[PDB]
Design an enzyme around this catalytic site. Structure first.
Site, PDB file in Angstrom:
ATOM      1  N   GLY A   1       0.760  -1.232   0.000  1.00  0.00           N
ATOM      2  CA  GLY A   1       0.000   0.000   0.000  1.00  0.00           C
ATOM      3  C   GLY A   1       0.792   1.283   0.000  1.00  0.00           C
ATOM      4  O   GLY A   1       0.179   2.354   0.049  1.00  0.00           O
TER       5      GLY A   1
ATOM      6  N   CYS B   1     -13.762   2.042 -30.754  1.00  0.00           N
ATOM      7  CA  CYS B   1     -15.078   2.446 -31.247  1.00  0.00           C
ATOM      8  C   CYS B   1     -16.064   2.445 -30.081  1.00  0.00           C
ATOM      9  O   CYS B   1     -16.902   1.554 -29.925  1.00  0.00           O
ATOM     10  CB  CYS B   1     -15.514   1.484 -32.333  1.00  0.00           C
ATOM     11  SG  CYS B   1     -14.490   1.650 -33.789  1.00  0.00           S
TER      12      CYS B   1
ATOM     13  N   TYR C   1       0.086  -1.933 -12.587  1.00  0.00           N
ATOM     14  CA  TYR C   1      -1.282  -2.347 -12.920  1.00  0.00           C
ATOM     15  C   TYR C   1      -1.686  -1.941 -14.333  1.00  0.00           C
ATOM     16  O   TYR C   1      -2.883  -1.766 -14.618  1.00  0.00           O
ATOM     17  CB  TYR C   1      -2.270  -1.806 -11.885  1.00  0.00           C
ATOM     18  CG  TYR C   1      -1.996  -2.321 -10.486  1.00  0.00           C
ATOM     19  CD1 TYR C   1      -2.246  -3.642 -10.163  1.00  0.00           C
ATOM     20  CD2 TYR C   1      -1.461  -1.500  -9.509  1.00  0.00           C
ATOM     21  CE1 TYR C   1      -2.026  -4.120  -8.898  1.00  0.00           C
ATOM     22  CE2 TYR C   1      -1.216  -1.978  -8.230  1.00  0.00           C
ATOM     23  CZ  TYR C   1      -1.482  -3.302  -7.939  1.00  0.00           C
ATOM     24  OH  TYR C   1      -1.264  -3.832  -6.677  1.00  0.00           O
TER      25      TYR C   1
END
Ligand SMILES: [Cl-]
Ligand SMILES: [Cl-]
Ligand code: NA
Ligand code: NA
Lengths: 462, 462
Positions: free
Chosen positions: A253, A381, A416
């Site tokens: 963290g 799209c 990530y």
């Protein structure tokens, strides 16, 4: 405010190229560890991510230096952050261990060279096959997340006649309601009976307790309060059960700065500002642990901090347009300058799904004033595939001279960002390049090919 | 009232197995087109999606019947919705055409057997390589999204000496969202005339008509009516000004699918999981506007979600369970939370997390049992946010109190935007996919990603 916002953003731009350990400029271009990123994006097809082994090393040093007051500290990179094999190799070569979050993550860590005794396996769903694989490979820790799972650990360790080394995950209620919002771990009230059960198991070895507070945490207090709960229970259980724990695992963290102008930021309202440093995290944890024991091993599981600052996403401006809103009498209300890059949220998922900010600059024009408000769109799209986390609202700043063919860089793109990519619209997941300690580059992940993407399907050929 | 919510949900459950065209029950289990889904999930490893070719066929019939008042309608499935080859094959064999959203989507449509004259290629970033591939394959339409892109279409069609057939995308500013600020796609209405005039002069570009696409899961017909009217009015005007007759008008997609069925309890404009309209309403609005101009012109439609959304179920095994308890300061229970963990999380069913999407959840192994217990439903990712927040009541779901680890949970209406959006976060594999064919037999149409698949893209020292 917009002029001052523009002034401030260009002060940050100048700081990238004159005061940042990662970056320089050459030929008007952003350089990363001496590598000209415009030139690099002419050598490899965009979009792609480029990682810096030197910056990974600097991040690991920050973390390890933070824990100098506690010699018996063991650092496990949370590999869910990034598990490209060449990134894992740089992390292993930088001297730390690995935390894994699935059977295949355990296997990748073993295959890139982490020993079993350098791997922690965590999870809420560890099926019998996962536990058999982990136990058979003599992992340093397998966490115990529930009583149900513990029954499988007991049964499988007995079947293999092999000791499973465990830490019991306890998620403290630190006041938003742990029972409603925390799927992971056991309640504090369940720790004693869980540990008692483990002591009686012949092939399960209780090593300590485990917690993980969360991600990108903007204050030290949650680490201090949660560590104290686990330290107090560790101390109490040592007395009640007549044991000495090997370790305590306090999780991860540590935040990373995604916005750097801390004088203008409140980390409690905008957690793109890092509210604390690795040193603050370490001070909080160590202080609480030392109220119990100074010799016990502290295990930490940083993810984001190891790699977040150590990659850039390079994406080519591939189209442009101006859209104009007119009033009912045909008079211009406003113009919007759209720049389309070849990476959208299938490539940089957190920019969309978790409202994550990354600095954006024109790497091909890095020394030019970023003096034009633009909206930055991806190639999917999908009307929602544009970057909403701008410099001011949904607007970014680029040089007004920005041209199709210019390379745009997103900074702090190393955590990530790879495994979270998709093949939405059948756009490929990206290649990944690494800058090594010598400043040389190599491809460490290919771009998905057409054949890669159709080969999972089973269909009669044509 | 929670008792009334539970009663309502169980009425919905009974309607699934005794009323819904897709489903039945056998041996206490949910059946899909006669296939026992508990049994199916013992034959194939969970989690996996199972598609119904019968239901795809029914959905296509709904769409095409809705357009009965306009004979010259051409229907292109928006393959970004789902492009697994066996799903595309089912749609091809049902007799409609394909819309593609990247070079590789065009290629896979050609490979599975759509002819070039059955393919529309749309996009905001169509690079020269994409355009060369499309033009070389004689596609029915390539949309023109920007003036910049149009210059590449002109140059490449000239180089290939092959006609590029185009429709010009025009996104109207229809007061509701501000188009210049919130719509990256298309040209402004004000640019349509000059764009069309220039295409007419190009030797290897053939102007077919105008294009728009309103959006996704649209809960009202007025947006389609208003936007279609703008494009019809400009089509009529340009025919007069330029002295041409357009082949077609392409009105895009956006027909919604019901994700909540109890319309009497919903407001679709506030909760668009309720479908605010049917395909018939969409067709009525489009046809009414087009027929104010021409009854003979071709109308092209690009439904995505409606074709496949209702036609798949996600099957996922309950793989762990735990009870968490909030205790007051006297150690008395404040409440219990029953957590059930399934082997699918948001890496498998991404929209449940990223777009707050609701899907009905039932215990397929106990489908005839009252779903009488409030539970929280978690996935397997090592991420505190990986649980299903879009519950029956807040974040809570209903399952039988008899639910056991090993039971199969079904998510209904899981056929749109659920496959290509998967990730390998935590190095959990993307799922297999099974098809129930129109004869009621099953086959695997996509394998689960293997460990080989996790690492084969990486380039690393052994
Ligand atoms: Cl270490
Ligand atoms: Cl058709
Ligand atoms: Na033991
Ligand atoms: Na022409």
């Amino acid at each position: 405010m917009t002029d001052s916002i523009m002034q401030n953003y260009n002060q940050l731009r100048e700081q990238v190229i004159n005061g940042d350990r990662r970056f320089q400029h050459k030929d008007g271009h952003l350089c990363f560890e001496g590598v000209d990123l415009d030139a690099l994006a002419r050598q490899y097809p965009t979009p792609f991510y480029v990682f810096s082994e030197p910056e990974i090393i600097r991040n690991i040093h920050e973390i390890q230096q933070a824990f100098a007051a506690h010699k018996n500290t063991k650092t496990f990179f949370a590999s869910k952050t990034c598990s490209v094999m060449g990134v894992l190799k740089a992390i292993r070569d930088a001297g730390i261990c690995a935390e894994a979050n699935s059977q295949y993550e355990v296997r990748k860590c073993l295959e890139i060279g982490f020993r079993g005794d350098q791997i922690v396996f965590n999870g809420v769903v560890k099926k019998p096959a996962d536990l058999e694989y982990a136990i058979a490979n003599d992992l340093y820790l397998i966490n115990v997340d529930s009583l149900y799972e513990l029954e499988h650990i007991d049964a499988i360790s007995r079947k293999l006649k092999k000791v499973a080394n465990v830490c019991v995950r306890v998620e403290p209620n630190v006041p938003l309601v742990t029972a409603f919002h925390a799927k992971s771990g056991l309640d504090l009230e369940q720790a004693e009976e869980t540990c008692r059960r483990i002591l009686a198991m012949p092939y399960v070895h209780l090593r300590g307790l485990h917690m993980h507070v969360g991600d990108q945490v903007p204050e030290s207090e949650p680490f201090a309060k949660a560590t104290k709960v686990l330290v107090d229970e560790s101390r109490r259980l040592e007395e009640v059960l007549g044991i000495k724990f090997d370790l305590i695992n306090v999780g991860g963290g540590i935040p990373v700065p995604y916005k750097y102008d801390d004088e203008n930021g409140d980390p409690l309202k905008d957690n793109m500002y890092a509210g604390i440093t690795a040193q603050d995290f370490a001070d909080a944890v160590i202080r609480e642990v030392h109220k119990w024991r100074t010799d016990v091993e502290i295990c930490i599981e940083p993810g984001r901090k190891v790699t977040g600052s150590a990659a850039v996403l390079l994406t080519e401006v591939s189209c442009e347009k101006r859209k104009t809103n007119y009033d009912l009498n045909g008079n211009v209300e406003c113009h919007v300058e759209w720049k389309f890059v070849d990476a959208g949220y299938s490539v940089l998922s957190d920019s969309q799904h978790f409202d994550w900010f990354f600095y954006v600059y024109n790497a091909s024009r890095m020394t030019a004033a970023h003096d034009a408000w633009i909206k930055l769109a991806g190639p999917l799209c999908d009307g929602g595939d544009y970057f909403h986390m701008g410099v001011k609202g949904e607007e970014f700043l680029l040089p007004k001279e920005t041209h199709v063919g210019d390379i745009v860089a997103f900074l702090d793109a190393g955590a990530y960002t790879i495994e979270s990519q998709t093949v939405f619209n059948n756009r490929p997941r990206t290649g990944v390049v690494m800058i090594d300690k010598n400043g040389d580059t190599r491809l460490i992940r290919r771009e998905d090919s057409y054949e890669d993407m159709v080969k999972y399907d089973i269909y009669l050929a044509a």
